[PDB]
Design an enzyme around this catalytic site. Sequence first.
Site, PDB file in Angstrom:
ATOM      1  N   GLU A  87       0.054  -3.083  10.487  1.00 34.01           N
ATOM      2  CA  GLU A  87      -0.441  -3.322   9.388  1.00 34.01           C
ATOM      3  C   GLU A  87       1.231  -2.599   8.483  1.00 34.01           C
ATOM      4  O   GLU A  87       1.316  -2.817   7.378  1.00 34.01           O
ATOM      5  CB  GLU A  87      -2.022  -3.294   8.909  1.00 34.01           C
ATOM      6  CG  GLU A  87      -1.359  -2.578   6.641  1.00 34.01           C
ATOM      7  CD  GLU A  87      -2.875  -1.965   6.582  1.00 34.01           C
ATOM      8  OE1 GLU A  87      -2.713  -0.787   6.855  1.00 34.01           O
ATOM      9  OE2 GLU A  87      -3.937  -3.131   6.365  1.00 34.01           O
ATOM     10  N   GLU A  88       1.395  -1.203   9.640  1.00 33.59           N
ATOM     11  CA  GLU A  88       2.160  -0.313   9.089  1.00 33.59           C
ATOM     12  C   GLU A  88       3.647  -0.532   9.058  1.00 33.59           C
ATOM     13  O   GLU A  88       4.498  -0.333   8.522  1.00 33.59           O
ATOM     14  CB  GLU A  88       1.635   0.666   9.206  1.00 33.59           C
ATOM     15  CG  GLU A  88       1.066   1.349   9.487  1.00 33.59           C
ATOM     16  CD  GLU A  88      -0.121   1.374   7.486  1.00 33.59           C
ATOM     17  OE1 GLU A  88       1.192   1.749   6.461  1.00 33.59           O
ATOM     18  OE2 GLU A  88      -0.704   1.106   7.355  1.00 33.59           O
ATOM     19  N   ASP A 129      -4.684  -3.116  12.340  1.00 28.77           N
ATOM     20  CA  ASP A 129      -4.868  -1.824  11.030  1.00 28.77           C
ATOM     21  C   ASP A 129      -5.223  -1.007  11.675  1.00 28.77           C
ATOM     22  O   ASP A 129      -6.190  -0.864  11.972  1.00 28.77           O
ATOM     23  CB  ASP A 129      -6.110  -2.682  10.486  1.00 28.77           C
ATOM     24  CG  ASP A 129      -5.854  -2.011   8.890  1.00 28.77           C
ATOM     25  OD1 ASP A 129      -6.167  -2.656   7.767  1.00 28.77           O
ATOM     26  OD2 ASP A 129      -4.888  -1.323   8.765  1.00 28.77           O
ATOM     27  N   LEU A 177      -5.694   1.967  10.385  1.00 30.39           N
ATOM     28  CA  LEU A 177      -6.855   3.091   9.484  1.00 30.39           C
ATOM     29  C   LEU A 177      -6.637   1.377   8.690  1.00 30.39           C
ATOM     30  O   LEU A 177      -6.003   1.412   8.040  1.00 30.39           O
ATOM     31  CB  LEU A 177      -5.515   4.469   9.441  1.00 30.39           C
ATOM     32  CG  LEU A 177      -6.765   5.067   8.979  1.00 30.39           C
ATOM     33  CD1 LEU A 177      -7.748   4.992   7.081  1.00 30.39           C
ATOM     34  CD2 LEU A 177      -7.876   5.618   9.744  1.00 30.39           C
ATOM     35  N   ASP A 178      -8.179   1.102   8.727  1.00 28.84           N
ATOM     36  CA  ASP A 178      -8.086   0.595   7.295  1.00 28.84           C
ATOM     37  C   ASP A 178      -9.759   1.537   6.290  1.00 28.84           C
ATOM     38  O   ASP A 178     -10.020   1.902   6.739  1.00 28.84           O
ATOM     39  CB  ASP A 178      -8.392  -1.104   7.886  1.00 28.84           C
ATOM     40  CG  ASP A 178      -8.955  -1.911   6.670  1.00 28.84           C
ATOM     41  OD1 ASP A 178      -7.532  -2.295   6.223  1.00 28.84           O
ATOM     42  OD2 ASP A 178      -9.850  -1.725   6.451  1.00 28.84           O
ATOM     43  N   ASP A 204       0.849  -1.200  -0.305  1.00 27.02           N
ATOM     44  CA  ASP A 204       0.415  -0.330  -0.186  1.00 27.02           C
ATOM     45  C   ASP A 204       1.167   0.987   0.223  1.00 27.02           C
ATOM     46  O   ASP A 204       2.102   1.037   0.531  1.00 27.02           O
ATOM     47  CB  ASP A 204      -1.170  -0.067   1.822  1.00 27.02           C
ATOM     48  CG  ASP A 204      -1.802  -1.530   1.419  1.00 27.02           C
ATOM     49  OD1 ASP A 204      -2.123  -1.721   0.228  1.00 27.02           O
ATOM     50  OD2 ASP A 204      -2.260  -1.349   2.062  1.00 27.02           O
ATOM     51  N   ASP A 216      -2.274   6.679   7.806  1.00 26.51           N
ATOM     52  CA  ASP A 216      -1.856   5.442   8.404  1.00 26.51           C
ATOM     53  C   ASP A 216      -0.526   5.700   9.297  1.00 26.51           C
ATOM     54  O   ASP A 216      -0.801   5.591  10.149  1.00 26.51           O
ATOM     55  CB  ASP A 216      -1.384   5.444   7.388  1.00 26.51           C
ATOM     56  CG  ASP A 216      -2.485   4.716   6.014  1.00 26.51           C
ATOM     57  OD1 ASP A 216      -1.811   4.264   4.823  1.00 26.51           O
ATOM     58  OD2 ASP A 216      -3.105   3.441   6.859  1.00 26.51           O
ATOM     59  N   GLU A 275      -6.893  -7.962   9.428  1.00 26.83           N
ATOM     60  CA  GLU A 275      -7.812  -7.700   9.038  1.00 26.83           C
ATOM     61  C   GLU A 275      -9.092  -8.566   9.063  1.00 26.83           C
ATOM     62  O   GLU A 275     -10.242  -8.877   9.764  1.00 26.83           O
ATOM     63  CB  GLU A 275      -8.330  -7.197   7.650  1.00 26.83           C
ATOM     64  CG  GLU A 275      -7.222  -6.019   6.928  1.00 26.83           C
ATOM     65  CD  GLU A 275      -7.368  -5.462   6.110  1.00 26.83           C
ATOM     66  OE1 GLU A 275      -6.411  -4.721   5.821  1.00 26.83           O
ATOM     67  OE2 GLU A 275      -6.725  -6.781   5.494  1.00 26.83           O
TER      68      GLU A 275
HETATM   69  O1  LIG Z   1     -10.553  -1.636  -3.652  1.00 23.36           O
HETATM   70  P1  LIG Z   1     -10.857  -3.560  -3.762  1.00 23.36           P
HETATM   71  O2  LIG Z   1     -10.189  -3.930  -3.981  1.00 23.36           O
HETATM   72  O3  LIG Z   1     -12.312  -3.347  -3.587  1.00 23.36           O
HETATM   73  O4  LIG Z   1     -10.199  -3.247  -1.981  1.00 23.36           O
HETATM   74  C1  LIG Z   1     -11.412  -2.913  -0.542  1.00 23.36           C
HETATM   75  C2  LIG Z   1     -10.715  -3.706   0.476  1.00 23.36           C
HETATM   76  O5  LIG Z   1      -9.532  -2.984   0.554  1.00 23.36           O
HETATM   77  C3  LIG Z   1      -8.742  -2.713   2.018  1.00 23.36           C
HETATM   78  O6  LIG Z   1      -8.731  -0.930   2.206  1.00 23.36           O
HETATM   79  C4  LIG Z   1      -8.131  -2.814   2.306  1.00 23.36           C
HETATM   80  O7  LIG Z   1      -6.793  -2.711   1.736  1.00 23.36           O
HETATM   81  C5  LIG Z   1     -10.781  -3.162   2.795  1.00 23.36           C
HETATM   82  O8  LIG Z   1     -11.033  -2.074   3.889  1.00 23.36           O
HETATM   83  C6  LIG Z   1     -11.411  -3.194   1.830  1.00 23.36           C
HETATM   84  O9  LIG Z   1     -12.547  -3.556   2.121  1.00 23.36           O
HETATM   85  O1  LIG Z   2      -5.518  -2.146   3.519  1.00 26.90           O
HETATM   86  P1  LIG Z   2      -5.788  -0.177   4.375  1.00 26.90           P
HETATM   87  O2  LIG Z   2      -7.033   0.065   3.911  1.00 26.90           O
HETATM   88  O3  LIG Z   2      -5.809  -0.500   5.944  1.00 26.90           O
HETATM   89 MG   LIG Z   3      -4.867   0.141   7.293  1.00 20.35          MG
HETATM   90 MG   LIG Z   4      -3.123  -0.269   3.754  1.00 23.31          MG
HETATM   91 MG   LIG Z   5      -6.014  -2.376   5.795  1.00 26.81          MG
HETATM   92 MG   LIG Z   6      -1.243   0.422   5.412  1.00 25.38          MG
END
Ligand SMILES: O=P(O)(O)OC[C@H]1O[C@](O)(CO)[C@@H](O)[C@@H]1O
Ligand SMILES: O=[P-]([O-])[O-]
Ligand SMILES: [Mg+2]
Ligand SMILES: [Mg+2]
Ligand SMILES: [Mg+2]
Ligand SMILES: [Mg+2]
Length: 328
Positions: A90-91, A111, A113-114, A61, A67, A273
């Site tokens: 994650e980071e 994670d 910030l997701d 990422d 983040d 996750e």
């Molecule tokens: O754009 P995509 O491939 O649907 O991925 C979305 C997924 O990616 C994330 O941001 C994780 O990287 C999740 O929060 C989310 O479910």
């Molecule tokens: O993968 P990222 O949205 O935590």
């Molecule tokens: Mg994250």
């Molecule tokens: Mg990320």
């Molecule tokens: Mg994530």
């Molecule tokens: Mg990240």
Amino acid sequence: TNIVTLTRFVMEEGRKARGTGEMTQLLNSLCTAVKAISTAVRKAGIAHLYGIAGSTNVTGDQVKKLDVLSNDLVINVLKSSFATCVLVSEEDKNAIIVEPEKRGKYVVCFDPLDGSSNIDCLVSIGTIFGIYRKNSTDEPSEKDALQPGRNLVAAGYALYGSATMLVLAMVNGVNCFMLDPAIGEFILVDRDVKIKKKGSIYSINEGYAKEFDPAITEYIQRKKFPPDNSAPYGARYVGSMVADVHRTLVYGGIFMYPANKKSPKGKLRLLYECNPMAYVMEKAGGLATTGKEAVLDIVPTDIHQRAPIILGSPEDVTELLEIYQKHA
Ligand SMILES: O=P(O)(O)OC[C@H]1O[C@](O)(CO)[C@@H](O)[C@@H]1O
Ligand SMILES: O=[P-]([O-])[O-]
Ligand SMILES: [Mg+2]
Ligand SMILES: [Mg+2]
Ligand SMILES: [Mg+2]
Ligand SMILES: [Mg+2]
């Protein structure tokens, strides 16, 4: 004048059992970071917090300024809690070993910030965490985070949505606490949450249609064209796992991030996750599978390992498992 805060709740969980208040210290500490992240998120464009930091993380990422801030907040409150010994973020490429004077019994994978793709458009984002007890006498090490999710003792997430919610699952169930912005406390709002046995929403990114396996393809066709003339399911895909999973919990239905022709293990990361969300779902009476095995039973070999995940209402997840079985 007698509000039921997350602290009070977790403390009574302890009253039900016996011994150590370390879990309460841990969760109290994590709550402080969640409030700080929420406040930052809620003013991010004024504070110039949108946009990229300056590196690329461990699983490819583009790192964002939120983040870095959220990671630092979570790492620093967990170190200071005296409740943790090993942190997986994650980071960070490697596990963080807490210094001797501040170690406690727990291992935390998170994670910070997701939902990165949704930061800049103000869509819901979140923080995800899972907590293990260290299972050994040896010096704490990255291998202490390599437990199957079945060994979790607590897991959940913070949702920075139209309101901020902390969803906490422990051995006896799932509870939802809403942040009261005026007093800075998480208040119990939903007790012993259970997912509907069957829902009416499916959640997946259909832009991957060309890469889906035949089981996912047949299941999505069945949601749109039900063979019994029942109403088609509706579709929702916020694009932030915390928001799509929280909707799945409270409205039912199914969320999917499966394996595909380019990604044999999916995208989402097992330790911080998939396992936390699978644990919340199983404690709420739902299911969480890769399509072939339970997410919580996977023994990880890599703290940044990916896993396919299909979770939600048990009758919906079972229907897709049947299609995988039929194709197998
Ligand atoms: O754009 P995509 O491939 O649907 O991925 C979305 C997924 O990616 C994330 O941001 C994780 O990287 C999740 O929060 C989310 O479910
Ligand atoms: O993968 P990222 O949205 O935590
Ligand atoms: Mg994250
Ligand atoms: Mg990320
Ligand atoms: Mg994530
Ligand atoms: Mg990240």
